[PDB]
Each structure stands twice: as C-alpha cells, then as structure tokens.
Design a protein around this ligand. Sequence first.
Ligand code: NA
Ligand code: NA
Ligand code: NA
Ligand code: NA
Lengths: 261, 260, 260, 261
Amino acid sequence: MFDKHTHTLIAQRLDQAEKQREQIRAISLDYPEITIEDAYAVQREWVRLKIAEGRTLKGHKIGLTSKAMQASSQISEPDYGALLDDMFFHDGSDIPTDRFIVPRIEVELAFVLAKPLRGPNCTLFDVYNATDYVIPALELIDARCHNIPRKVFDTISDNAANAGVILGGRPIKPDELDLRWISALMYRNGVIEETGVAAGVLNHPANGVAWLANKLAPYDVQLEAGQIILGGSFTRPVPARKGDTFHVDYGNMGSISCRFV
Amino acid sequence: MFDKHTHTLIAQRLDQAEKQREQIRAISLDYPEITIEDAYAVQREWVRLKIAEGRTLKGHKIGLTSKAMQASSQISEPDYGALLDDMFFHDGSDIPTDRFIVPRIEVELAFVLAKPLRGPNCTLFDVYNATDYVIPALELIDARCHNIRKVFDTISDNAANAGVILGGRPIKPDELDLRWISALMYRNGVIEETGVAAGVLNHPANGVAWLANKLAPYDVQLEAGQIILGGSFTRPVPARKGDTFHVDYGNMGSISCRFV
Amino acid sequence: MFDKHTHTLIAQRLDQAEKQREQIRAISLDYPEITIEDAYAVQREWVRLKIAEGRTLKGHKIGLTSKAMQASSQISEPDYGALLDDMFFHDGSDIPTDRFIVPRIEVELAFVLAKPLRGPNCTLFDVYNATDYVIPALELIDARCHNIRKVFDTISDNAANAGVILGGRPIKPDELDLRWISALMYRNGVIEETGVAAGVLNHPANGVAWLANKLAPYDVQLEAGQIILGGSFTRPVPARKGDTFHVDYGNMGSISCRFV
Amino acid sequence: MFDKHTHTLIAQRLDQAEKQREQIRAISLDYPEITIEDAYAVQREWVRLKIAEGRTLKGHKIGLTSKAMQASSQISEPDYGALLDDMFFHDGSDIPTDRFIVPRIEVELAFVLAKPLRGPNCTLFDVYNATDYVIPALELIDARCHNIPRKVFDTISDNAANAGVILGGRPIKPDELDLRWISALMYRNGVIEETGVAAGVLNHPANGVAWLANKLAPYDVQLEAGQIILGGSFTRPVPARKGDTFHVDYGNMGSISCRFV
Ligand code: NA
Ligand code: NA
Ligand code: NA
Ligand code: NA
C-alpha cells in the first residue's frame, strides 16, 4: 500500500486528465508495484476530490463482469466505481462528444434502491428486498490513461472507467419478470453492432449489487436508499464518435436512445 | 480468375490439411492476386472432391454475418459454405477433438426446408413459405490455413465449416418472432457469450434468401430437405479437449456436447 | 444412548476423515448398538466443533426423502443436517475435487426464510408465511465413512453434507405451483437424471415444516435468514475431476459448476 | 450370425417361457458368442411366430434410452421391440398379474402416426410431419430370461422386454406444446415412487422414432401409418405386484391408471 499522499497525487492527475481530455501514462507503468487496494484508494480519493468540487454521489456501477467470468481472461472478479450526478444524461438527449476522450457505450440494467444494502453477507435476496425498480441503463465509459499496455489497476484507479449514464425504457418491480432473460439489440447509426442477454452479467444481473455491498462493508460504506446501481454490461462496449446515433432496444423493457454531437 | 487446374490444386491442399489436421500457409499469401470468384471456385472444387469421396450435401451455411453488419469491419457481405453429412453430430455427443485443428463453437438457428428455394429475387417471405421447421443449431468452425485478403482464405476453406450440432425445440416459422430468440453459451459451466437472433442480419431468415440469390447464377438452388444455418448470434468460442458446451436458447431448448 | 464423551470422540474421527479426505470404518460397525438419538448427538457434536473452529451455521437440509417415501425401502422418515458457510459455492464456480472423497450432486429447491420457523405443529402454511424466496439449489453430498443400520452412519456424518450451490431464478412462494418445478441434470453434456419437485415429500415445502418439528424438542428453531434445502428430486450423480454439471430447471433458471 | 434354425429355436423357447410364465436361462449364457444382429433376428422370429398364431402388429417401442445415455453404463444406443395387439390394456382397467413373470411399469409418450416413416435419413422433422397425435403411454415390461447375469442381447432377443401398453390422458398435436418439458409423477398405492421429464428420453422424446425408422430400413421395413410408437421411459421401471394401484400424473397432459389383480 502506498502513502495516502501518493493516492491523492494519482487522483489529481486523473482529474486533470478528465478535465483536459488528455490521457496520462498508465498508472501501473509509473507505479509498477501498485496493488488492487491502492487502485481502490486512488478511486476513493478521486471521488472525494470530485464531491469536494460540488458533485454528488448518485450510486455505483459493477464492471468488468464479462472478463471476470470468461476463462481466458486473467481477471478474477468484477470491479466497481462511483456514479456522480454530472454523469447522468437524459434518454434521447445530445451528448457532448468533446467532453470525453475515447467514449464507448455499454448495455446494462440499473437497480434503484428503496432501502439500504449493507455487507457483509449481503445476498441476492437482500437485493430483491431493497430494490424499488429495475430499469434499462446505458453506460458511457472512457479512459483517462493511455491503452498502449494498460492493466486492471489502471481501470479501477480511473473510477472503473466511469463517464456517463443514460437511463430509459420501462421501469419494473424486481418480481415482474425473470431478469435473467432481458435481452437487447444495440444499434449504432441504424445498424445492430451488438446483442446480449442479461444473464451474461454474472449469471444474474442482480448478483453484482450484493457483491458490491459486501466489498464496501469494510470501509463502513453501504449502498444507500435512492441510489442507482448499474449491474454490468451484457454487451462488448461500442465506440461512440461525433455524429453517432445510438438506439438500444430491450424488447418489452423499452429502449434508450442518444446522439453524439 | 485462375485456371480450373489451379482451383483443383488448392482444393487438394485444403483437403490434405483437413485430413492431416495440419494447417497450410494462407492461400492469399501464396496466391496474392486471388479473387472472391477464385475463392468460391476453390470451395466448389473441394466440395466436389469430398462428395466424390462418398460424402453427401446436406445443406449450406451463411457466415461472417456480424462482420458484414459491423460498420468498422471491411467485410461488405456474408459468405457461404456447403454442409456435408459427416459434419453432423447429435445433441449431447462426445466430439473427437483430434479430428479438428483450431475448432470454435458458434450459436445459430437452422432452417429445415420443405420446398426448394431459388434465386434471383428470393425473399424473406419465400423463406417462410419454404421452411418446414426452425431449430437451434451449433456450428463448429475450423481453419485449415494458418492465421498469422484473408476473407479469400476463409471462403476457399469452405467458409470454415467443420461441424454442425442440431438440438432443442423444433418450431414452425410462424410460432413466435424469430428475431427475439436469445441464447446463453456456456463452456465448462460459465457463460462465455450471449446473443439475440436479430443480430443475424436483422432477421435470422434473411441469410437464407440471400444465399439462394448468391447460388442462382451457378444454376444451383437450395433443395427440399436441406438444412440452412443462417449465421451466428455470438462470437465464436474456442473448443479444447475436455470442454463441455451447453447452449441455452430459453424456451427454444438447448444444445450440448463434450470434446473428448 | 452413549455418554457425551463417546459422541465427541466419534465427531472428532469424522472431522479428521473430512480434513484428510480419508474414510473411516462405518460408525455402526464399530458401535453396533448405536441409536438414531446417538447419531444426531454425534452430528450435533461435530457441528459444534466445526463452528468452534470458525464456521457459521447458514441453514439446514432434509435428506433421504425419496427413500422415506419409497415403499420398498426400510427408511421410515427423512434425515437432516446442518449447512455451514464454507459449504457454499457460487453458480458457475470451479469446485475443488480434491477437497472431497466421493462427491455426488443432488437437485433441490431452497427456501430462504424471512421469519423464524418453530415446532411443534409447524405446518406447510407456516413455511409459506415465513419464506422470503424459493430458489433452485444443488447439494454436493459426500461420505466420510466407508460404504462396503447404515442410516446411523449417514446421520452422524452430518447427513452427508459437503457442498451447496444456489442459482437460477428467485421467486416468491406464491408465484407458481412449486410442486411442478421440474429439472434436467446434465453431466458432461448428457442428461443423467430428471425429476419433478413433488417427488420431494409430495410438496417441496413439506420437509421444512417437518424439520422445524424435529428440532423443537432441542430448543432449536429455523432462524430468519437461514437457507433450507428440502430434499432431492433426483438420485445423486457422482462428481469426478473434469466433470461439468448443468442443471436446467426450465423457467426457474439453471445452476452449473465444474469440478477441477 | 447363427443359422436361422438357431434363431427359431431360441424364439420358440422365449414363447414357451412367456406362455408358461416360467423364465429360461439367459440366452447369452447358453450362446456365449451371440451378437446384436442375432438378438434382433431372434426377436424378428418370435414376432413372426406370434403373428402366425393370430396376433397383429400395432407398433413399436424404443427402450434402454436412459442406459444408452448415461455415461456409466456400457450400452451405446437404445434398443427396440414390436408391439402386438394383445399387449394393449385400457386406461383404468384391471391387469391380470398372473399373465406376467416380473412385471414393471414405465412412464412414456406414444406417437400415433398418420403417415409412414421410412429410413434411412429419417429425421426428427419427418417424425413431426408424420405424427397425428402424441399421447401419454405406460409400458409394462417383463423378462422371460433369469436375471442372476443377464445382458442386452438377452433383452433384445426377448422382444426388448415388451409385455403391456396402457394409453391414456390427453391427446395432442405434436406442435401444441414443447414435448421436452412434459413431466410426470408415478404413484403406486398412493405414494410417488418415481418422477421424470420427457427430455430424459434422448434429449427429445421424438428422437427415438426417427432412430427406429433408420434401424428398420435395411430390412425393407418401415413404420406404418396408424402405428403407435413408444419413445422410451423417463422414469426407472417400478415393480408391479398383485393388489397394486398405479396412477401416473402427467400434469396438463392428463393421467393413466390401472390396478393389478
Ligand atoms: Na476470468
Ligand atoms: Na461491414
Ligand atoms: Na420407505
Ligand atoms: Na451409455
């Protein structure tokens, strides 16, 4: 573990990278001995910094769910990041492309909590009990560190690649239908680029939420009522470029659209 | 276009590559001016040779459907290959890994034809009229050429064909919306890929009509009784000795196999 | 009834059998006058020891449900065992085969309690009232005693408990008729067993009420938050290194794992 | 392969065993070199003998489907036998226990053909096209050879253990519902003894029918229109004893009952 001073410095550089839309060198290259604990400490510092600037915590996301599952990727479990108020964009809105560096769109489900979730021993059943609504959600992810390589410690430090969130479609009670079989078609500029099924997220798209509550418990942190929790992408991320229209069709769960300007 | 004898020569090399389970150099490297027409001519020659050896044509597949669709891929349209009787394995079979080189599993839908389909101007509606049943189908794809322009290699190599595994629930085309058939591909207990049938050319029947139209100028049609695989809704997943696969198509049933 | 010290001694032997993955002689052979009361006393001692070592009680299981029902089996009623935290594996996990002796997979339904259940006179309706969710659950059972009267060995051996794997679709008890939940157990791509939930004591919730009633005289109840496995709808299937399991509960989802 | 004379002799002994309700020695013990081809030839001879006596061919069954599938059984594929008119008992009827030796009840689905099925290259799709109705069916199986051992060649010779058939419940068109998920509870004397799901029969309960048509093709034999084809048991066989009542509940597919007297 590094000194807190080091964590703060790395966070400051990530912050400047985001604000200037200019990537820094991969943190893992400058800090070869960085640990997963250091990476989450950098994240916590950056989130603290951004909230001090006037932002508000609105929830969390669980990421790297596919890579955590797939056998031929070295990664052993998912990651997590914090969602801030300024990350949220309305369904059907213009997204300012110049605000981002290498943005990509992911297809997810969001859990809107009615009740807090606190670890350890948080279970899928606790998630069901605490969830007010499930709603489709797109994530816009980005990278403040250069890719050419980059590692998981860099992504985690970099607030798990968080940049944007777009909620939309049909809100449902958790018991309304089997969440495992929610499916989606991601269109970009009139063409299907990816498809996926929600079970591709950790066997059940709610599993990440309980896992997250358990990860946050040691820090005396819980998932608060009113928070929005993004469970993971059931598609590979798709690059977003200026002029692109996205339309993600979740069938009977509705759709989410946006345009990059 | 190369002369017929060159097409026969390349086909013979691919044939021995398959039989010996030993990859040859990419055809496009050895023949730098190979065309798409040459590639299909090589494929035709190889299929002819394999049928002469005692195999029987059972259908066709449409491949490279995702790449054809994807904006950032150079591939402009799908490819096709011939399905032969010895490519078919039963649901829940042990699959001999040693017979293959670098096998990968794809998740598809098969169209079992009751009537012939002939181009040009074959349409989605023609496909529906001619289809007896739709059934889940896995493809096992392979490569007889070394991996490390390259579309010509794949096409010559009978569009990567190697195996087919049918299984699950047979349905009439009109039973449900084929576009929203969804699948989870498990390997060794873990979901490796997921996908939805609309990912195959917007409608999984579209490739069938497209194929009939591609074959028409050669005085070839899709025959009654043929099985047509329309494209994969997932990226292919490597198959290795010891692997079990289970592909869950929800209410459309499942297909499983084990590599031994 | 044996003295407490004898119960402790037998429990210690079972504990070392589990830790060393080395079977001991059947307890009923070494103690020919062992009773059912002794067997549960041994189980209680072993659970106490394992909890003292740092494990936590997470629930219970009801076993031997089919034998209890079958007319041609001597077993008159089900058995029960304690489920501990280190027995639980996630859906889609690699399971370490070396940790077990002769592991077998069973197909069950779990009841996740929102409220306590206490006997005597606990009923099906009490179970429904106290259950938060029902979810598919696999059990991995094992034997710390050599196989080649014998019910006493199983009961002492914590009712063959070893592993638990939850997965699939969580439902409220009232969502559908639990009696007709059905499953296909695949191992290595092939269906080895099938069964229907009503095969568990006529209704898969019945064992939960039965268990509460068995535990009451010991001043023990089923606690809120506990996971109760009610019995297997299939015969157990051996698990060996390299095996993949996939248990398809239809619209109730699936549970999978691989033994490594 | 034995001489036809040998096949006829074995068939005659099986016939006497059935008529006298007295088991013979396992054929494989008396004929150590017997092949699967010999076993089906013995079967064909016995069926010919029984039809010459005045019986009529009503269909076929596919058996040993579970053992053919399970990894820890040596058997590689299913078996088949011929169903004769006198094997059929009405739903809800008394079954004369004295007519049988060691009878056991199996739980199956029957396919009633509207059109003939001829191999080779008969497919599941041909079965669907030729099937008029699917209906629940119980099989009563028996053994004319002693068990203490007996092998597959003995069972096949012994007309694949055929003895009885009981049709009942709800007839459906093949396309009415997914046949794979038809499920059943077998009660004997008020107690559930076995349960099972139809997919346990070769992954699809119709698969055996196409397989059978393909097996019969070399003999210039086809499955005829009007024939009843039993696809295989999705339960282990359960002994039937004098005084036993059976009730097999196929849920929304109805039930079949009988009593042994
Ligand atoms: Na991984
Ligand atoms: Na393209
Ligand atoms: Na009993
Ligand atoms: Na077998």
